[PDB]
Amino acid sequence: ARGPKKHLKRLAAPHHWLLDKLSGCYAPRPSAGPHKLRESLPLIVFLRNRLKYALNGREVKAILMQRHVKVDGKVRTDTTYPAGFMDVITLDATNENFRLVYDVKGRFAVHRITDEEASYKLGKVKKVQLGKKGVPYVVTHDGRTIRYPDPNIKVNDTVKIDLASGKITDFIKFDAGKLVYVTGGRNLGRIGTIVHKERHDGGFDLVHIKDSLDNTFVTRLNNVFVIGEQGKPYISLPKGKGIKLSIAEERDRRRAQQ
Amino acid sequence: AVTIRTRKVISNPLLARKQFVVDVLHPNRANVSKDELREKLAEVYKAEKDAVSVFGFRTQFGGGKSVGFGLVYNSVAEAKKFEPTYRLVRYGLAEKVEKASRQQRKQKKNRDKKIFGTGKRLAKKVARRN
Amino acid sequence: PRAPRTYSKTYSTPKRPYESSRLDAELKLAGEFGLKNKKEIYRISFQLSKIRRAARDLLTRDEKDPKRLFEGNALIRRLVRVGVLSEDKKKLDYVLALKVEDFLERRLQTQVYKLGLAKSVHHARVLITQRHIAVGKQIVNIPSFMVRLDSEKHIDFAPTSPFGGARPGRVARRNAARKAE
RNA sequence: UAUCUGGUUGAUCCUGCCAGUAGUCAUAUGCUUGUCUCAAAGAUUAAGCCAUGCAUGUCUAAGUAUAAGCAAUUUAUACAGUGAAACUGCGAAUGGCUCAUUAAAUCAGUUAUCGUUUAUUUGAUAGUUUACAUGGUAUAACUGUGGUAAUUCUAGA
RNA sequence: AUUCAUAAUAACUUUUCGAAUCGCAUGGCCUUGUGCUGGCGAUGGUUCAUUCAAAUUUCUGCCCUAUCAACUUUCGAUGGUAGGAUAGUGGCCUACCAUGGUUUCAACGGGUAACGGGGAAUAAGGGUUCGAUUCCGGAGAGGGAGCCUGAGAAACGGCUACCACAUCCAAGGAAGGCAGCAGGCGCGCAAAUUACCCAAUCCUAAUUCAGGGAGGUAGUGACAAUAAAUAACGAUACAGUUGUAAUUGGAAUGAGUACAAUGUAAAUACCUUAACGAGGAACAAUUGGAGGGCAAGUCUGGUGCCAGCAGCCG
RNA sequence: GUCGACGUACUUCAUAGGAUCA
Ligand SMILES: [Mg+2]
Ligand SMILES: [Mg+2]
Ligand SMILES: [Mg+2]
Ligand SMILES: [Mg+2]
Ligand SMILES: [Mg+2]
Ligand SMILES: [Mg+2]
Ligand SMILES: [Mg+2]
Ligand SMILES: [Mg+2]
Ligand SMILES: [Mg+2]
Ligand SMILES: [Mg+2]
Ligand SMILES: [Mg+2]
Ligand SMILES: [Mg+2]
Ligand SMILES: [Mg+2]
Ligand SMILES: [Mg+2]
Ligand SMILES: [Mg+2]
Ligand SMILES: [Mg+2]
Ligand SMILES: [Mg+2]
Ligand SMILES: [Mg+2]
Ligand SMILES: [Mg+2]
Ligand SMILES: [Mg+2]
Ligand SMILES: [Mg+2]
Ligand SMILES: [Mg+2]
Ligand SMILES: [Mg+2]
Ligand SMILES: [Mg+2]
């Protein structure tokens, strides 16, 4: 190619969007934004294919141009705005607030939240560095640059960002016994407690996570997101509480509830 | 008799309307016109007929029932504002715009691309030359 | 372009089409169940082969193997639901013992014959293709329709059918009009 | 190969042998071709040659209208409704097609940029630089005068 | 892990940036001035970070060929130093230096009807073959060479030369690139429509609206696949409880025709459905193979009257 | 030139044996 691509075939689109393979030939390409392409849910798919509010792309554009959709407390109008992990989607007319969280199956789940819990978000500190004029700043997983951080905040910590002011309200250190959420890999969507961090200089760090059912799994450190202390999450978790269930047990539960 | 049932009803304030699936049981009848269903839905939901839209009617194999998707807007102005132009034309709320076939429009676009400026000067020049 | 739509063959030619015993068995099956051509027998043989191969493969695995338990339970459930496998025979061993005739038995043509609506299997086929038979509230015009245990009790003449309480067909009212004239 | 059929002599058995009978896929071709659903369209190693037509343009309240544009108007003697043409900005490097070249090349998996550029999006970020606001160091569209057989040709004022 | 982030000192610059831009609206202070102050947005702008990307890059993995055994090095091949260039590392190039680098563990050379992969076929398993072709990545736009613009191009539905073709011409000149969608030629023997639409998918723009042969819709050789009509129930007759009906009775139904409605951007079609639509149900199912029998008939041969060939012809 | 060698492709000849019976 001679430049950046602007099209996305349906088959090449991220699996977890759950797009029909025969509805069309192309899929929404998320525009550049806070989140990466493969780890983002564009607003069109959220409003049309998940909430079923809009029947087709044109109605989604009609919704957005009315300025009813807010992402992280700011109005967005791009149909392909890449909403992602820990972003708050507010629809005032419906009096609805959503937080985008992966369910156990690894897909973004429609999770309804109260307004108070919608007042803030959580961000993984991706970088801590001194800016120009000797001003420290922190860059989070969603690309927010926050100046004058608390000095104790280090990389891989979690910061609770208030959306109204864009400032850090509190922070959680990455330590053993903390509650964490998996945001990548085959263990995507699971929740557990840290047990031990293996360090490999010049390589990818590994973290052992024990679930509430005492099952253990190892995951690369880049895919871990600290969300609180054990039993005291700082956000409301989706149904299932991040517990992975075997196929047989899922069958049993499904038959029972039916 | 004919019985209309509304199912999977969603209330969308964003588009200012109500979505649902309409199931029509029509024994001993071929099927029901969209106009009659629009009237009946308007009566049941207490709205203008102009504010009711219906489509996607496919009588199942063996006949006797039809299934499609139905919309009830809060007031007629919103119906005109959000409804697709073609569905408005179906209902008579809007008039079809007459336009030439795509080939003619594209050829005219190319011929205009050929000319630069208003073209009156070219007309006067050719008139003087000949 | 648009993503592919999958397709598959539902039948395969037997290893030996020319065996005399096979020809005789096909003749017997076709006559007993009123099958149009050998393609139906080949189709049902293909399905039964697929199920029995799957049953073999699951049996090969160790007992209590989670894949074995799950897949065997699902297969036995499906076979019991469709009526081929009886309630008391819920073991993969008895799945492996199935025969083609059991599948031919569940066909809507055979069931329509057995329940007494038709005087011949061919009469049942003609009735089915002429839109006279309804499973539940629904008209079915496919002889190869496989009837479930729940659905077997709801086979009846369709409401729209002249035999089901509707108006007489074209021939009947035509003759009545001619007689009246 | 397999099973089955037939020959192996004056006949019948038991061997052995021989001939024919298996397969889908692929190419070409013949005959037929009523209904429902669904779906594809290369090939002369000729990436050989193409008539004609179309396939990339784009304007919001929010860059520039004294169009001698349209329509309302005394809800405006600076403009303000709509708006051709042109300047300006953006796009045209996406998409679509083909497999000629290419044998550690491409490509697959896996690494690195403490070795570098990055329109755009998102978030931060600049009291330190006649002003009730500077020029043509300037032109398009437009008016008018013209050249060529001819072209998305353009010359002077 | 750093000469990292950042800061500071002294200077330097054809040297930048630090809002001379636009819409909507008319709030608050008073010393009552078209005084001071002030809201909601658009578009610009330095640097950092993020995102879409780009470039180079580490390890391992490619079919046939040894009757290709030595190759690379003069004109860069291996490495050092300094410089030029690059967005940047680097023999990428320049100048001076050394003589290096690969190879029977197959280098180098040759063939390839060689784009690579996800995959497809077969097989009991090992294996064998195919993969132009719905997705990913690479290269190209008749063949070489070279560039403006722009963040992004060695672009070709951008430009310039040359090579080859080829169009207009008043002979002075001008204009070319279907391996995009349709549609032609390449033979004297052949095969989809120069159709409709942006309604769904998403993409482009100053942008809800315009545009999109990308794409969708329909048309068209049985590509490859699914289901599935062409009759069912009786009576009578004839013939050696079986077979045969241009025998016979009234019941059912869709191929097709068609009000209507549904469907669609508008249509066609499907599913529905008033009304028509069956006895040779002539509403006339096909493709292959095997075996007969007949004459004042024909040919050929002979241990009479026969045998072979064959028989649309007597 | 109905030439030699080689390469390639095809054709062809070598199948009856034991037991019983007349
Ligand atoms: Mg690292
Ligand atoms: Mg009927
Ligand atoms: Mg033919
Ligand atoms: Mg027919
Ligand atoms: Mg029909
Ligand atoms: Mg080579
Ligand atoms: Mg390599
Ligand atoms: Mg842009
Ligand atoms: Mg910015
Ligand atoms: Mg001038
Ligand atoms: Mg040198
Ligand atoms: Mg150097
Ligand atoms: Mg090739
Ligand atoms: Mg290949
Ligand atoms: Mg390929
Ligand atoms: Mg190229
Ligand atoms: Mg060509
Ligand atoms: Mg080029
Ligand atoms: Mg192009
Ligand atoms: Mg072209
Ligand atoms: Mg073409
Ligand atoms: Mg096409
Ligand atoms: Mg603007
Ligand atoms: Mg048809």
mmCIF file of C-alpha atoms in Angstrom, chain A:
data_model
loop_
_atom_site.group_PDB
_atom_site.id
_atom_site.type_symbol
_atom_site.label_atom_id
_atom_site.label_comp_id
_atom_site.label_asym_id
_atom_site.label_seq_id
_atom_site.Cartn_x
_atom_site.Cartn_y
_atom_site.Cartn_z
ATOM 1 C CA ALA A 1 0.000 0.000 0.000
ATOM 2 C CA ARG A 2 1.006 3.626 -0.541
ATOM 3 C CA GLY A 3 -0.559 4.992 2.647
ATOM 4 C CA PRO A 4 -2.874 4.383 5.593
ATOM 5 C CA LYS A 5 -5.773 2.020 5.007
ATOM 6 C CA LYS A 6 -9.356 3.248 5.311
ATOM 7 C CA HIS A 7 -11.406 0.058 4.779
ATOM 8 C CA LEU A 8 -12.055 -2.995 6.947
ATOM 9 C CA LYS A 9 -13.505 -6.201 5.538
ATOM 10 C CA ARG A 10 -16.082 -7.922 7.721
ATOM 11 C CA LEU A 11 -14.086 -11.137 8.045
ATOM 12 C CA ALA A 12 -11.002 -9.182 9.128
ATOM 13 C CA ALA A 13 -12.918 -7.257 11.795
ATOM 14 C CA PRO A 14 -12.412 -8.131 15.474
ATOM 15 C CA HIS A 15 -14.219 -11.326 16.397
ATOM 16 C CA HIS A 16 -15.714 -10.057 19.650
ATOM 17 C CA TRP A 17 -17.812 -7.465 17.816
ATOM 18 C CA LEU A 18 -20.049 -10.380 16.746
ATOM 19 C CA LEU A 19 -20.818 -9.150 13.241
ATOM 20 C CA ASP A 20 -22.957 -11.051 10.766
ATOM 21 C CA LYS A 21 -20.718 -12.366 8.006
ATOM 22 C CA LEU A 22 -23.405 -12.129 5.283
ATOM 23 C CA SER A 23 -25.051 -8.779 6.085
ATOM 24 C CA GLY A 24 -22.529 -6.904 3.967
ATOM 25 C CA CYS A 25 -18.970 -6.821 2.707
ATOM 26 C CA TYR A 26 -17.416 -4.134 4.948
ATOM 27 C CA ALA A 27 -17.415 -3.438 8.679
ATOM 28 C CA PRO A 28 -16.981 -0.182 10.618
ATOM 29 C CA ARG A 29 -13.328 0.778 10.792
ATOM 30 C CA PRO A 30 -12.805 2.522 14.152
ATOM 31 C CA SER A 31 -11.244 5.918 13.642
ATOM 32 C CA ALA A 32 -8.065 6.849 15.457
ATOM 33 C CA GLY A 33 -8.755 7.563 19.096
ATOM 34 C CA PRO A 34 -8.075 6.729 22.736
ATOM 35 C CA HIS A 35 -8.060 2.942 22.220
ATOM 36 C CA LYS A 36 -6.377 0.627 19.746
ATOM 37 C CA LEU A 37 -8.296 -0.703 16.762
ATOM 38 C CA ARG A 38 -8.550 -4.343 17.819
ATOM 39 C CA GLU A 39 -9.431 -3.494 21.448
ATOM 40 C CA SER A 40 -12.212 -0.972 20.781
ATOM 41 C CA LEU A 41 -15.966 -1.013 20.215
ATOM 42 C CA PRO A 42 -17.142 1.683 17.762
ATOM 43 C CA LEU A 43 -20.310 3.488 18.764
ATOM 44 C CA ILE A 44 -22.152 2.243 15.673
ATOM 45 C CA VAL A 45 -21.845 -1.392 16.754
ATOM 46 C CA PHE A 46 -22.789 -0.457 20.316
ATOM 47 C CA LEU A 47 -25.937 1.476 19.403
ATOM 48 C CA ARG A 48 -27.081 -0.826 16.582
ATOM 49 C CA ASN A 49 -25.852 -4.376 17.204
ATOM 50 C CA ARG A 50 -25.924 -4.401 21.035
ATOM 51 C CA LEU A 51 -28.580 -1.976 22.285
ATOM 52 C CA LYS A 52 -30.716 -2.323 19.121
ATOM 53 C CA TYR A 53 -31.716 1.339 19.417
ATOM 54 C CA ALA A 54 -30.802 2.040 15.773
ATOM 55 C CA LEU A 55 -31.740 -0.218 12.860
ATOM 56 C CA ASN A 56 -29.013 0.897 10.436
ATOM 57 C CA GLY A 57 -26.029 3.196 10.140
ATOM 58 C CA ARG A 58 -28.019 6.219 9.009
ATOM 59 C CA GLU A 59 -30.154 6.163 12.155
ATOM 60 C CA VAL A 60 -26.956 5.936 14.197
ATOM 61 C CA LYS A 61 -25.694 9.073 12.462
ATOM 62 C CA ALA A 62 -29.045 10.708 13.213
ATOM 63 C CA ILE A 63 -28.635 9.837 16.899
ATOM 64 C CA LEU A 64 -25.068 11.110 17.112
ATOM 65 C CA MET A 65 -25.758 14.398 15.341
ATOM 66 C CA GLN A 66 -28.481 15.077 17.917
ATOM 67 C CA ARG A 67 -25.724 15.171 20.576
ATOM 68 C CA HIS A 68 -27.481 12.616 22.808
ATOM 69 C CA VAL A 69 -24.479 10.266 23.151
ATOM 70 C CA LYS A 70 -21.686 11.227 25.536
ATOM 71 C CA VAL A 71 -18.438 9.300 25.925
ATOM 72 C CA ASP A 72 -16.608 9.964 29.193
ATOM 73 C CA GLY A 73 -18.775 13.025 29.778
ATOM 74 C CA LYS A 74 -17.974 14.589 26.383
ATOM 75 C CA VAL A 75 -20.285 14.634 23.376
ATOM 76 C CA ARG A 76 -19.022 12.638 20.392
ATOM 77 C CA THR A 77 -20.484 12.735 16.882
ATOM 78 C CA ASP A 78 -18.266 10.268 14.987
ATOM 79 C CA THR A 79 -20.092 7.039 14.200
ATOM 80 C CA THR A 80 -16.819 5.082 14.406
ATOM 81 C CA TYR A 81 -15.492 6.699 17.576
ATOM 82 C CA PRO A 82 -13.451 3.935 19.254
ATOM 83 C CA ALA A 83 -15.076 3.480 22.636
ATOM 84 C CA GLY A 84 -13.294 0.849 24.694
ATOM 85 C CA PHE A 85 -12.420 -0.566 28.094
ATOM 86 C CA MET A 86 -13.518 1.466 31.143
ATOM 87 C CA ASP A 87 -15.182 4.175 29.017
ATOM 88 C CA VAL A 88 -18.508 5.538 30.255
ATOM 89 C CA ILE A 89 -21.255 5.915 27.642
ATOM 90 C CA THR A 90 -24.092 8.179 28.776
ATOM 91 C CA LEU A 91 -27.450 8.385 26.996
ATOM 92 C CA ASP A 92 -29.302 11.074 28.919
ATOM 93 C CA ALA A 93 -32.616 10.810 27.069
ATOM 94 C CA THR A 94 -32.938 7.129 27.993
ATOM 95 C CA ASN A 95 -31.521 7.971 31.439
ATOM 96 C CA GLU A 96 -28.984 5.193 30.852
ATOM 97 C CA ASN A 97 -25.302 4.895 31.710
ATOM 98 C CA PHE A 98 -23.077 2.062 30.515
ATOM 99 C CA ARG A 99 -19.545 0.964 31.327
ATOM 100 C CA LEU A 100 -17.812 -1.176 28.709
ATOM 101 C CA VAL A 101 -16.513 -4.325 30.414
ATOM 102 C CA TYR A 102 -15.646 -7.680 28.890
ATOM 103 C CA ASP A 103 -17.869 -10.533 29.978
ATOM 104 C CA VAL A 104 -16.473 -13.996 30.660
ATOM 105 C CA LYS A 105 -16.818 -14.987 27.001
ATOM 106 C CA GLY A 106 -14.455 -12.152 26.046
ATOM 107 C CA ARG A 107 -16.955 -9.707 24.516
ATOM 108 C CA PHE A 108 -17.973 -6.191 25.453
ATOM 109 C CA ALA A 109 -21.081 -6.507 27.606
ATOM 110 C CA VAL A 110 -23.968 -4.086 28.013
ATOM 111 C CA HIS A 111 -23.547 -3.222 31.706
ATOM 112 C CA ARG A 112 -25.911 -0.638 33.165
ATOM 113 C CA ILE A 113 -24.525 1.558 35.941
ATOM 114 C CA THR A 114 -25.764 4.193 38.345
ATOM 115 C CA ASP A 115 -24.974 7.858 37.783
ATOM 116 C CA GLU A 116 -22.640 8.039 40.791
ATOM 117 C CA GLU A 117 -20.512 5.135 39.583
ATOM 118 C CA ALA A 118 -20.622 6.775 36.150
ATOM 119 C CA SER A 119 -18.953 9.870 37.617
ATOM 120 C CA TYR A 120 -15.482 8.284 37.427
ATOM 121 C CA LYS A 121 -13.406 5.728 35.552
ATOM 122 C CA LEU A 122 -10.308 3.601 36.104
ATOM 123 C CA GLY A 123 -7.085 3.852 34.129
ATOM 124 C CA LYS A 124 -3.938 1.740 34.041
ATOM 125 C CA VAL A 125 -0.864 3.956 34.324
ATOM 126 C CA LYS A 126 1.064 3.143 31.145
ATOM 127 C CA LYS A 127 3.776 5.761 31.624
ATOM 128 C CA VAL A 128 5.137 8.176 34.234
ATOM 129 C CA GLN A 129 7.503 10.816 32.909
ATOM 130 C CA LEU A 130 8.663 14.402 33.302
ATOM 131 C CA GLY A 131 7.306 16.761 30.660
ATOM 132 C CA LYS A 132 8.569 20.140 29.563
ATOM 133 C CA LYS A 133 9.438 22.644 32.294
ATOM 134 C CA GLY A 134 9.975 19.793 34.760
ATOM 135 C CA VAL A 135 6.289 18.901 35.178
ATOM 136 C CA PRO A 136 5.634 15.204 35.932
ATOM 137 C CA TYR A 137 2.746 13.600 34.093
ATOM 138 C CA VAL A 138 1.111 10.200 33.715
ATOM 139 C CA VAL A 139 -0.214 8.575 30.547
ATOM 140 C CA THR A 140 -2.947 5.990 31.077
ATOM 141 C CA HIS A 141 -4.219 3.155 28.898
ATOM 142 C CA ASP A 142 -6.771 5.467 27.232
ATOM 143 C CA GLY A 143 -4.243 8.139 26.264
ATOM 144 C CA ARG A 144 -5.100 10.653 28.986
ATOM 145 C CA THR A 145 -2.187 12.876 30.010
ATOM 146 C CA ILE A 146 -2.605 13.983 33.634
ATOM 147 C CA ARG A 147 -0.124 16.461 35.088
ATOM 148 C CA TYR A 148 1.127 16.654 38.670
ATOM 149 C CA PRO A 149 0.496 13.034 39.708
ATOM 150 C CA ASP A 150 0.978 11.752 43.213
ATOM 151 C CA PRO A 151 4.687 10.782 43.320
ATOM 152 C CA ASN A 152 3.959 7.293 44.657
ATOM 153 C CA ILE A 153 2.055 6.474 41.457
ATOM 154 C CA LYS A 154 4.252 4.214 39.318
ATOM 155 C CA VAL A 155 3.756 2.276 36.102
ATOM 156 C CA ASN A 156 1.136 -0.509 36.098
ATOM 157 C CA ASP A 157 -0.742 1.139 38.990
ATOM 158 C CA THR A 158 -4.411 2.088 38.657
ATOM 159 C CA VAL A 159 -5.755 5.641 38.913
ATOM 160 C CA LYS A 160 -9.385 6.598 39.534
ATOM 161 C CA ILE A 161 -10.034 9.521 37.173
ATOM 162 C CA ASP A 162 -12.951 11.876 37.766
ATOM 163 C CA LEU A 163 -14.434 12.627 34.355
ATOM 164 C CA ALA A 164 -15.606 16.151 35.197
ATOM 165 C CA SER A 165 -12.139 17.478 36.081
ATOM 166 C CA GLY A 166 -9.887 14.812 34.573
ATOM 167 C CA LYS A 167 -7.923 14.506 37.822
ATOM 168 C CA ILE A 168 -6.811 11.557 39.939
ATOM 169 C CA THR A 169 -9.069 10.913 42.927
ATOM 170 C CA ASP A 170 -7.193 7.889 44.305
ATOM 171 C CA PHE A 171 -4.793 5.188 43.182
ATOM 172 C CA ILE A 172 -4.092 1.497 43.721
ATOM 173 C CA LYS A 173 -0.600 0.030 43.763
ATOM 174 C CA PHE A 174 0.076 -3.195 41.878
ATOM 175 C CA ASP A 175 0.797 -5.627 44.714
ATOM 176 C CA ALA A 176 0.123 -9.220 45.678
ATOM 177 C CA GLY A 177 -3.411 -9.834 46.905
ATOM 178 C CA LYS A 178 -4.953 -7.140 44.703
ATOM 179 C CA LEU A 179 -8.036 -7.774 42.583
ATOM 180 C CA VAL A 180 -7.295 -7.712 38.855
ATOM 181 C CA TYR A 181 -9.149 -7.993 35.561
ATOM 182 C CA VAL A 182 -7.758 -9.671 32.440
ATOM 183 C CA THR A 183 -7.943 -7.476 29.330
ATOM 184 C CA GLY A 184 -6.189 -9.665 26.756
ATOM 185 C CA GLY A 185 -5.478 -13.190 25.658
ATOM 186 C CA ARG A 186 -7.581 -16.313 25.968
ATOM 187 C CA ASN A 187 -8.237 -15.520 29.648
ATOM 188 C CA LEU A 188 -9.934 -12.278 28.581
ATOM 189 C CA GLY A 189 -12.670 -11.146 30.959
ATOM 190 C CA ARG A 190 -11.634 -13.241 33.967
ATOM 191 C CA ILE A 191 -11.235 -11.731 37.439
ATOM 192 C CA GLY A 192 -8.876 -12.851 40.161
ATOM 193 C CA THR A 193 -6.310 -11.992 42.805
ATOM 194 C CA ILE A 194 -2.586 -11.597 42.197
ATOM 195 C CA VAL A 195 -0.472 -14.412 43.654
ATOM 196 C CA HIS A 196 3.029 -13.670 42.366
ATOM 197 C CA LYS A 197 4.765 -11.664 39.646
ATOM 198 C CA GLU A 198 7.591 -13.375 37.779
ATOM 199 C CA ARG A 199 10.133 -10.836 36.514
ATOM 200 C CA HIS A 200 12.234 -11.444 33.403
ATOM 201 C CA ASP A 201 14.578 -8.591 32.561
ATOM 202 C CA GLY A 202 14.437 -7.793 28.868
ATOM 203 C CA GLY A 203 11.310 -9.918 28.460
ATOM 204 C CA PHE A 204 7.592 -10.033 29.132
ATOM 205 C CA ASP A 205 6.650 -10.212 32.798
ATOM 206 C CA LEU A 206 4.218 -12.932 33.869
ATOM 207 C CA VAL A 207 1.588 -12.716 36.612
ATOM 208 C CA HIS A 208 -0.134 -15.610 38.379
ATOM 209 C CA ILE A 209 -3.812 -14.995 39.119
ATOM 210 C CA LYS A 210 -6.020 -17.094 41.397
ATOM 211 C CA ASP A 211 -9.761 -16.932 40.816
ATOM 212 C CA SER A 212 -12.459 -17.083 43.495
ATOM 213 C CA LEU A 213 -12.933 -20.768 42.619
ATOM 214 C CA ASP A 214 -9.211 -21.303 43.495
ATOM 215 C CA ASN A 215 -8.358 -22.014 39.842
ATOM 216 C CA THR A 216 -5.053 -20.429 38.828
ATOM 217 C CA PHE A 217 -3.797 -19.087 35.510
ATOM 218 C CA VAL A 218 -0.710 -17.257 34.248
ATOM 219 C CA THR A 219 -0.992 -14.170 32.046
ATOM 220 C CA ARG A 220 1.374 -11.629 30.535
ATOM 221 C CA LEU A 221 1.624 -8.474 32.617
ATOM 222 C CA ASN A 222 0.430 -6.251 29.765
ATOM 223 C CA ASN A 223 -2.984 -7.957 29.938
ATOM 224 C CA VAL A 224 -3.597 -7.325 33.671
ATOM 225 C CA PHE A 225 -5.597 -4.371 35.020
ATOM 226 C CA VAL A 226 -5.796 -3.730 38.768
ATOM 227 C CA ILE A 227 -9.391 -2.914 39.731
ATOM 228 C CA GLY A 228 -9.336 -2.973 43.530
ATOM 229 C CA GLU A 229 -8.662 -4.991 46.647
ATOM 230 C CA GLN A 230 -10.089 -8.484 47.066
ATOM 231 C CA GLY A 231 -13.828 -8.359 47.653
ATOM 232 C CA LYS A 232 -13.856 -4.553 47.273
ATOM 233 C CA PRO A 233 -13.885 -3.657 43.576
ATOM 234 C CA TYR A 234 -13.858 0.044 42.775
ATOM 235 C CA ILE A 235 -16.372 -0.519 39.943
ATOM 236 C CA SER A 236 -19.471 -2.648 39.566
ATOM 237 C CA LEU A 237 -18.624 -5.908 37.820
ATOM 238 C CA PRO A 238 -20.780 -7.594 35.164
ATOM 239 C CA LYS A 239 -22.815 -10.704 35.816
ATOM 240 C CA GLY A 240 -20.806 -13.811 36.575
ATOM 241 C CA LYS A 241 -18.194 -11.691 38.379
ATOM 242 C CA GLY A 242 -15.514 -12.787 35.927
ATOM 243 C CA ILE A 243 -15.733 -16.480 36.849
ATOM 244 C CA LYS A 244 -14.968 -18.918 34.041
ATOM 245 C CA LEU A 245 -17.434 -21.804 33.906
ATOM 246 C CA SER A 246 -16.899 -25.131 32.185
ATOM 247 C CA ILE A 247 -19.091 -26.130 29.254
ATOM 248 C CA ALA A 248 -20.760 -28.909 31.256
ATOM 249 C CA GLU A 249 -21.581 -26.611 34.173
ATOM 250 C CA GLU A 250 -22.879 -23.997 31.740
ATOM 251 C CA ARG A 251 -25.176 -26.649 30.265
ATOM 252 C CA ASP A 252 -26.413 -27.580 33.734
ATOM 253 C CA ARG A 253 -27.076 -23.975 34.744
ATOM 254 C CA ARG A 254 -28.803 -23.201 31.438
ATOM 255 C CA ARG A 255 -31.091 -26.213 31.757
ATOM 256 C CA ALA A 256 -31.861 -25.334 35.380
ATOM 257 C CA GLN A 257 -32.776 -21.691 34.766
ATOM 258 C CA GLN A 258 -34.827 -22.545 31.661
#
